[PDB]
Amino acid sequence: AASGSALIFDEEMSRYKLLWTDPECEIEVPERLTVSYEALRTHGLAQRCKAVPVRQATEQEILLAHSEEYLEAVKQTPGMNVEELMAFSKKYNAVYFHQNIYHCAKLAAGATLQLVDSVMKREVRNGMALVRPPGHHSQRSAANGFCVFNNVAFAALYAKKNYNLNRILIVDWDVHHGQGIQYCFEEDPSVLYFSWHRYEHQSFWPNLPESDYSSVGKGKGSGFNINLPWNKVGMTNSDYLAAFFHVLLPVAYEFDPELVIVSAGFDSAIGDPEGEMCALPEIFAHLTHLLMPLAAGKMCVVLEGGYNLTSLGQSVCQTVHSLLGDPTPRISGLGTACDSALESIQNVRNVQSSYWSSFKHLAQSEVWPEPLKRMPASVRTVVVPPPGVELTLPKNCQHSISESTAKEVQRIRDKHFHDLTDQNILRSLGNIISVLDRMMRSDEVCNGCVVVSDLSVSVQCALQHALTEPAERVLVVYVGDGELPVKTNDGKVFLVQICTKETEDKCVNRLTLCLREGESLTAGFMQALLGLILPVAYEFNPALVLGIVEETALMRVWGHMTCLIQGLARGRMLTLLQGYDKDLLELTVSALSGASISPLGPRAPKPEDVEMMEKQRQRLQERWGLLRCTVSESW
Ligand SMILES: O=C(NO)c1ccc(Cn2ccc3ccccc32)cc1
Ligand SMILES: [K+]
Ligand SMILES: [K+]
Ligand SMILES: [Zn+2]
Numbered sequence: 001a002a003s004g005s006a007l008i009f010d011e012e013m014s015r016y017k018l019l020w021t022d023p024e025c026e027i028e029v030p031e032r033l034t035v036s037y038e039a040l041r042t043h044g045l046a047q048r049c050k051a052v053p054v055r056q057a058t059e060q061e062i063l064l065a066h067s068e069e070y071l072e073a074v075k076q077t078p079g080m081n082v083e084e085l086m087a088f089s090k091k092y093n094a095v096y097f098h099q100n101i102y103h104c105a106k107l108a109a110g111a112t113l114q115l116v117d118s119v120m121k122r123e124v125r126n127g128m129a130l131v132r133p134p135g136h137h138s139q140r141s142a143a144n145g146f147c148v149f150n151n152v153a154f155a156a157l158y159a160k161k162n163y164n165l166n167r168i169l170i171v172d173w174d175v176h177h178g179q180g181i182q183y184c185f186e187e188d189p190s191v192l193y194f195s196w197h198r199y200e201h202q203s204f205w206p207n208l209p210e211s212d213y214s215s216v217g218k219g220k221g222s223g224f225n226i227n228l229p230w231n232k233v234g235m236t237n238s239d240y241l242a243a244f245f246h247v248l249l250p251v252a253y254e255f256d257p258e259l260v261i262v263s264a265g266f267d268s269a270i271g272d273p274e275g276e277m278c279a280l281p282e283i284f285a286h287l288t289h290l291l292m293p294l295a296a297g298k299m300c301v302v303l304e305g306g307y308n309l310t311s312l313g314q315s316v317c318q319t320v321h322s323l324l325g326d327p328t329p330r331i332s333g334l335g336t337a338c339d340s341a342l343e344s345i346q347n348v349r350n351v352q353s354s355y356w357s358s359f360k361h362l363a364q365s366e367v368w369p370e371p372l373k374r375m376p377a378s379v380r381t382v383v384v385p386p387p388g389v390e391l392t393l394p395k396n397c398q399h400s401i402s403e404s405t406a407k408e409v410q411r412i413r414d415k416h417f418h419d420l421t422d423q424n425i426l427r428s429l430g431n432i433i434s435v436l437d438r439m440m441r442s443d444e445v446c447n448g449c450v451v452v453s454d455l456s457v458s459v460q461c462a463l464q465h466a467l468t469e470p471a472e473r474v475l476v477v478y479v480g481d482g483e484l485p486v487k488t489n490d491g492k493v494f495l496v497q498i499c500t501k502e503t504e505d506k507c508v509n510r511l512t513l514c515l516r517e518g519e520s521l522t523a524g525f526m527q528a529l530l531g532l533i534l535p536v537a538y539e540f541n542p543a544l545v546l547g548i549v550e551e552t553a554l555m556r557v558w559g560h561m562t563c564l565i566q567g568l569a570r571g572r573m574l575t576l577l578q579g580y581d582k583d584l585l586e587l588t589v590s591a592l593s594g595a596s597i598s599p600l601g602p603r604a605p606k607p608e609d610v611e612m613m614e615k616q617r618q619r620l621q622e623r624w625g626l627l628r629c630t631v632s633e634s635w
Contacts, residue, residue, distance in 0.1 A: 001122065002122040002123070002124065002125045002297075002596065003124070003125055004049070004050045004123075004124045004125060005048070005049050005050065005124055005125065005126050005127050005128070005320070005323045005324050006049060006050050006051075006052045006114075006115055006118045006119070006123075006124040006126075006127030006128070007040070007045075007046055007049035007050070007051055007052075007127065007128055007130070007320070008051070008052045008053075008054060008111045008112075008114050008115050008118075008127065008128070008129040008130070008131075009033075009037055009046075009051070009054070009111075009129070009130040010053070010054040010107060010111070011033075011034070011037075012054075012103070012104060012107060013033055013054075013104045013107055013108060013111075013130075013131060013132045013133075014030035014031075014033040014034055014132060015030065015100055015104070016030070016098035016099075016100040016101040016103075016104050016132075016133075017029065017030050017098060018096045018098075019082050019085065019096070019098060020082065020086055020096075022096065024094065025094070025095075025096050025146075027273060027274065027307045028096075028146045028307070030132065031309060032132065032306060032307070032309065032312060033130055033131075033132050035309045035312055035313050036130050036303070036306075036312060036313055036316045037130060038313070039312075039313030039314070039316060039317055040313075040316060040317060040320055043317050043321075045317060045320045045321060045324065046320075048324055049127075049128075049320070049324070050118075050123070050124055050127075052114050052115070052118050052123075052124075052127070053114070054107050054110055054111045054114060055107075055110040055111070055113070055114055056106040056107060056109075056110045057106050057109035057110040057113060057149075057154065059071070061109070061110075061113065061154065061158065062106075062109065062149060062154075064153075064154060064157040064158065064161070065140060065149070065150050065153040065154055065157055065184055066138075066140055066141070066149060066150075067140050067141045069141060070140070070141040070142065073088075074102050074105075074143070074148060075102060077097050077099070077101065077102050078099055078100070078102050078103065080097070080099065085097045085098065085099070092142055092143045092144060093144055093145070093206075094137075094144065094145045094146065094205070094206075095143045095144060095145060095146055095147065095148070096146075097143075101133060101148060102148070104132060104133060105133055105148035105149050106149075107131070108129075108131035108132060108133055108134075108135065108148075108149070108151050109135075109149050109151050109154050111129045111131050111151075112129050112131065112135070112151040112152065112154055112155045112300070112302055113154060113155065113158050114129070115127045115128075115129045115155070115300045115302070116155045116158055116159050116259075116300055119259070119298050119299070119300055120159060120163050120259065120298065125297045125298070125596060126292070126297055126298065126299040126300070126301070126323050127299075127300060127301070127323070128264070128300075128301040128302070128303070128316075128319060128320060128323060129151075129300070129301070129302050129303065130303050130316075131151060131302065131303050132303075133146055133147055133148050134146050134147045134151075134265070134303070134304045134305055135147050135149060135150045135151030135152050135153065135154075135180070135263070135302070135304065136150065136151075136152055136153075136172055136174060136176075136178030136179075136180055136181050136263045136265075136304055137150075137176070137178065137179060137180050137206070138150045138180045139179070139180045139183050139184075140183070140184070144179075144180065144206070145176065145205070145206065146305075147180065150180045150181060150184060151302055152170060152172075152178070152181055152261055152263050152302050152304075153180060153181055153184045153185075155261050155300060155302065156168045156170060156185070156191045156261060157184075159259055159261075160190065160191075165190070165258045165259055166190055166258060167190060167192070167255060167256065167257045167258050168190065168191045168192070168257055168258065168259050168260075168261065169192050169194070169252055169255060169257035169259070169260045169261070169294065169295070170185075170191060170192070170193045170194070170260075170261045170262075170263065171194050171248065171252075171260065171261070171262050171263070171287075171291065172193065172194065172195035172196075172197075172262075172263035172265075172304075173196060173240075173262065173263070173264060173265065173268055173284075173287060174195075174197070174263050174264070174265025174266075174267060174268060174304040174305050175197060175198050175265060175267040175268035175272065175274065175275035175277060175305065176197050176198065176205070176206070176265065176267070176274075176305065177195055177197035177199070177206065177208065177211040177227065177229075178193075178195050178197075178263055178304075179206055179208055179210060179211065181193055181195075181263065182195070182210065182215065182225055182227075185221065185224070185225070186217055186218050186219075186221055186225065187217065187218045187219040187220055187221040188220075188221050188224065189217075189220050189221045189223070189224045190224075191224070192224045192225075192226070192251070192252075192255050192257065193224065193225050193226065194226040194228075194247075194248050194251070194252075195226070195227055195228070195263075196227075196228040196229075196230065196240075196243055196268075197211065197227070197228075197229060197230065198229075198230050198233065198275060198276075198277070199211055199212065199229030199230055199231055200230075200231055200232070200233075201231055211227055211229060212227060212229055213227050213228065213229060213344065213347045213348040213351055214351055215227055216351060216352060216355065222355065223352065223354070223355025223356065226247065226248070226251065226348065226352065227348065228243055228247055228344055228345070228348050229344055230277070230340070230341070230344065231340050231343070231344060232338070232340040232341075233275075233276040233277060234276065234277060234278045234338075235277045235278060235279065235338070235341060236277075236278045236279060236338070237278075237279050237280060237282075237283045237331055237333075237334060238334045238335055238336065238337050238338075238625070238626060239279075239337045239338060239341040240268075240279050240283050240287065241283070241286070241331075241334060241535070241538055241626060242336075242337035242341060242342070242345060242535075242626060242628070242629065243337075243341070243345060244287065244290055245530055245531065245534055245535045245538075245626070246345055246349065246531065246535075246629035247345060247348055247349060247352075249290060249291075249530045250356070250358035250359070250527065250530055250531065251352070251356050251358065252291070252294055253294070253526055253530065253560075253600075254356060254357060254358060254523075256294075256599055256600060256601045256602075257294055257295050258295055258298075259295050259298045259300070260291055260294050260295050260298065260299045260300070261299075261300045261302065262288075262291075262299065262300065262301040262302060263302060263304045264284075264301045264302060264303055264304060264319060265303070265304030265305035265306055266281075266284070266305065266306035266311065266312055266315040266316065267304075267305040267306050267307055269281055269283070269284070269306070269308075269311045269312075269314075269315045270311060270367070270368050271308040271310065271311035271367050271368065272306065272307050272308050272311060273307055273308065274305070274307055280331075280368065280371075281311065281314035281315040281317075281318045281371055282318055282329045282331060282371055283318075283331070284315045284318045284319045284322075285318040285319070285321060285322045285328045285329055285374075286322075286328055286331065286567050287319075288301070288318075288319050288322035288323060289322045289328050289564075289566075289567050290534075290564065290567065292322070292563070293559075293560050293563045293564060293597045294599070295599065296596045296597065296598070296599060297596035297597070299323070301319055301323065303316075311368075314370075314371055317371070318371065321374050324376070325376070325594035326374045326375070326376045327374055327376065327377070327446060327566075327570045327571040327572075328374075328566065328567045328570065328571060329371060329372065329374065329570065330541055330568070330569065330570055331538065331541065332541050334538050334539045334541065334626055335539060335625040335626060336625025336626060336628050337625070337626070337628065339631055339632075342628055342629065342630060342631045342632075343631055345629050345630075346629060346630045346631060349362060349629060350362055350363075357523075357604035357605075358527060358531075360604070361607070361610050361611075361614070366607075375443070376446075377443065377444060377445055377446035378443070378444040378445065379396060379397065379398045379444065379445050379446075380396040380397065380445070380446045380447070380592070380593050380594060381394075381396060381397040381398070381445070381446065381447055381448060381449070381589060381592045381593040382397065382398050382399075382400065382435050382438065382445050382447075382448035382449075383397055383398065383399060383400075383448065383449050383585075383589050384399065384400045384428075384431045384435065384448070384449065384450040384451060385399075385451055385580065385585060386451050386580050387424075387427070389580060391582065391585075391586065393589065394589070394590070394593045394595065396593055396594070397589060397593055400431050400434065400435065401430050401431075401434060402430075402434055405430055405433050405434045405437070406430060408433055409426055409429045409430050409433065412429065412461060413426070416460070417457055420457065422453075422454075424453055425452075425453055425454050425457060425458075428450060428451075428452045428453065428454075428458055429457065429458065429461050431450050432450055432452075432458060432461055432462050432465070432574070432576075433461065433465055435448040435450060435574065436462070436465055436466060436469070436544075436574060439544070439572045439574065440466065440469040440471065440544065440572065441469065446570075446571050446572065446592075447566070447571060447572060447573045447574065447575075447592045448574050448575070448592070449574075449575040449577065449585065449588050449589055449592060450574065450575070450576055450577075451576075451577050451578075451579070451580055451585065452576050452577070452578055453578070453579075455480075455484075455548070455550060455576070455578050456484070456485055458576050458578075459484060459485055459486075459546070459548060459576065460485045462546055462574060462576060463476070463485070463486070463493070463546060466543075466544050466546070466574075467492060467493075469543075469544075470543075471542075471543035471544045472492065472543050473491070473492055473493070473494070473540060473541065473542045473543050473544075474492065474493050474494075474542055474543065474544045474545075474546055475493075475494050475496070475537055475540055475542035475544070475545045475546070475565075475568060475569070476493060476494065476495045476496065476545075476546045476548065477496045477498075477533075477545065477546070477547045477548070477561070477565065478495065478496065478497050478498070478547075478548040478549075478550075479497075479498045479499075479548070479549045479550065479553060480497075480498075480499065480548065480549065480550030480552075480553070480578075481499045481500055481501060481550070482550075484497075484548075488507050488509035488510055489507075489509075491509070493509065494509050494510070494511075494536065494537075494540050494542070495509065495510045495511070496510075496511045496513075496533055496536075496537075497510065497511070497512045497513070498513050498515070498525070499512060499513070499514055500514060500515075500517065501514060502514035502612070505619070508619075508620060508623045511532060511533065511536060511616060511620065512616075513525075513528050513532075513612070513613070513616070514612065515528075515609055515612075516606055516608055516609060518606070519603060520603065520605050520606040520609060521554070522556055522557055522600065522603070523603040523604055523605040524605030524606065524609040524610070524613075525557050526557060526560065526600075527605060527609075527610065527613065528613050528616075529557075529560070529561060529564065530564075531613060531617070532613060532616055532617060532620075532627065533565075534564060534565075534567075535624065535626040535627050536620065536624045536626070536627060537565065537568050538567070538568065538626060539624050539625065539626045540568075540624075541568070542568050542569045543569055543572070544569050544572050544573070544574070545565055545566075545568055545569050545572065545573035545574070546573070546574055546575075546576070547562070547565075547573060547574070547575040547576065547588075548575075548576045548578075549575075549576070549577045549578060549584070550578050551578045551579035553584075555583065555584055555587065556600070558584065558587055558588065558591070559587050559590070559591045559597045559598065560597060560600075561591075562575070562587075562588060562591035562592060563591050563597050566592075573592065575588050575592070617629075
């Protein structure tokens with residue numbers, strides 16, 4: 001029953017600043033914070049967020065990750081003049097101190113804990129803290145790289161201590177390596193740390209051997225540390241999405257964290273003077289989106305870096321938009337990760353293969369343009385159960401006709417289905433059309449679910465009506481066996497079929513997954529979802545998703561499926577379920593509407609299934625480059 005998104009912020013954290021000439025520190029300015037709140041205010045997103053107030057972290061809380069000695073040294077800095085502050089700063093690397101910075105660091109820390117309490121008490125579903133100074137570089141007894149105290153380290157330890165959590169995921173998508181966080185949880189298997197970061201074969205700051213893919217943790221923590229070094233600059237949306245689909249999410253869903261914490265630095269975004277990567281802000285709408293099915297949505301985004309004041313606010317707004325569940329922007333031009341990225345992706349996968357049952361088969365050889373507006377839909381979701389059925393609906397849904405819509409069904413009938421008169425089927429067809437009309441052209445409805453009786457006529461009308469809408473491209477996800485009125489010959493339709501009997505597949509616009517039924521089914525299905533289905537879908541960039549389920553269908557995966565596949569097509573998905581099922585219709589509507597998803601926790605899948613999936617990657621990765629997670633073989 002949790003709802004809303006906290007936005008923790010306070011203008012006091014912008015009242016410390018660099019007080020002497022130092023060109024390497026110039027970039028880290030108070031204006032980073034004011035630009036960010038103001039952007040969220042301009043776009044109406046700050047107003048939609050519960051503004052939880054900042055507090056100071058207590059001394060007892062700071063000692064969870066820091067040392068009496070180093071805390072007492074920093075506690076002395078508010079009494080210092082500028083000479084003394086320069087001297088204290090020079091005992092550390094890439095960090096300046098200010099009379100007010102111990103004050104703000106305590107606030108940046110306290111703000112993060114405020115976010116943790118709000119999320120874990122169900123007062124909000126998720127949140128984001130706009131803090132200065134950053135956290136992820138600082139260590140138990142030192143400040144480093146603009147950080148004083150490790151705000152995200154605090155959050156996990158705090159959430160460990162006061163909520164008795166066993167599994168916490170920390171995703172550090174900042175462009176620098178959060179070495180403070182890795183040090184803190186090195187031997188700890190209850191806090192899984194994933195970081196990607198600019199490395200350039202250790203030439204990039206902080207220049208640490210520990211930053212490479214080979215550091216997997218120590219002792220009982222081996223496997224619970226994951227570094228993905230970028231060894232070239234200019235990494236693109238396709239490189240970030242490849243890292244999620246083929247490293248982070250496979251490990252994240254098997255881990256099944258009880259809470260997700262993001263070190264969200266946006267120096268990894270296009271335009272940043274320190275990161276020099278090429279991902280558009282829109283990418284962060286999806287990095288957020290892809291993780292929200294974890295831990296029932298309990299996500300704590302915590303600002304780290306970001307230095308181009310323009311690129312900064314755009315990426316913050318994309319993250320909060322997604323936190324509030326607004327529709328995700330379509331990403332165009334996705335394709336293969338570059339060669340350096342595939343090398344890094346392939347190296348970390350191989351070294352981690354001893355630890356995760358998603359890479360296990362790898363071990364035994366058998367300046368840029370503006371984002372476009374994302375206002376949420378009038379009504380998010382439209383439901384059309386059988387006539388007579390009426391269950392209760394979330395606050396943002398609605399039941400289903402028109403005269404125009406009725407002339408089409410008659411028009412469609414006489415042309416293509418002359419020998420059909422079932423006034424029930426012909427109702428479904430009217431519903432499909434009218435619900436698609438409200439999705440494809442009105443910004444009013446987002447997605448919908450229609451229960452249907454005859455599948456073949458329902459799908460045909462759904463599909464053909466969408467193509468003339470115009471929908472340049474339609475992705476079709478079908479769970480069932482048998483033929484289906486689909487023409488996957490031109491580039492306008494891609495079909496994903498999940499069936500029980502295998503099928504030699506000729507066409508390359510198709511992905512047929514035959515999963516040997518059993519206890520294996522759920523674990524393997526979701527390897528294929530993150531490993532194959534999402535990467536193809538993302539490259540395809542559909543205008544509309546059409547989900548279909550035949551009546552002889554198991555169910556425990558459809559919510560994750562529905563939640564994730566809404567990253568395509570600005571969330572415009574129509575779902576045709578054949579036959580009434582209270583539970584499935586309830587689950588489909590719940591996921592479509594933005595609700596949180598029940599986690600899965602636990603198995604590992606059958607080799608006949610993982611081999612079936614790698615035959616599919618082999619058969620498709622040359623058409624669909626985003627499927628690649630190795631370097632191409634050169635002639
Ligand atoms: O945004 C960040 N991290 O998340 C981050 C960005 C840039 C730096 C580099 N840098 C800053 C001052 C200085 C002095 C000497 C050597 C290097 C230095 C460090 C950290
Ligand atoms: K990072
Ligand atoms: K760890
Ligand atoms: Zn950074």
